[PDB]
């Protein structure tokens, strides 16, 4: 019962990649570059 070593290794690699991707999903402070223009 429990994880096999291959399962543990694959899970650890997949979660490391997932955490890297999720961290990459964040935004920089200047990330939404908005172009400005006006016409009681």
């Amino acid at each position: 019962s429990g994880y096999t070593p291959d399962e543990k290794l694959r899970l650890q690699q997949l979660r490391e990649l997932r955490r890297r991707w999720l961290k990459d999903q964040e935004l920089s402070p200047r990330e939404p570059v908005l172009p400005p223009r006006r016409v009681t």
Binding site: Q25, E26, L27, P29, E31
Partner: protein, 70 residues
């Protein structure tokens, strides 16, 4: 707190552009039409019914009320 994330969504640029084009053209024609209708109604319209003068035959467009219809 600075924990802003990226929201994955389809490109709404094309839909917004199409809606803007539709609104632009529809207004481009409607606004002059609405202005003309308002001016005609306030300055020209509202004909009033009258009895036909004796011996005078009216034109085929003299039997209608609204000036645009005439």
């Amino acid at each position: 707190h600075g924990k802003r994330l990226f929201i994955i969504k389809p490109s709404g640029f094309y839909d917004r552009r199409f809606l803007k084009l539709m609104r632009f053209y529809i207004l481009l024609t409607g606004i002059p039409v609405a202005i003309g209708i308002t001016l005609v109604n306030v300055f020209i319209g509202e004909a009033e019914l009258a009895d036909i003068p004796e011996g005078y035959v009216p034109e085929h467009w003299e039997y209608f009320k609204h000036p645009i219809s005439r």
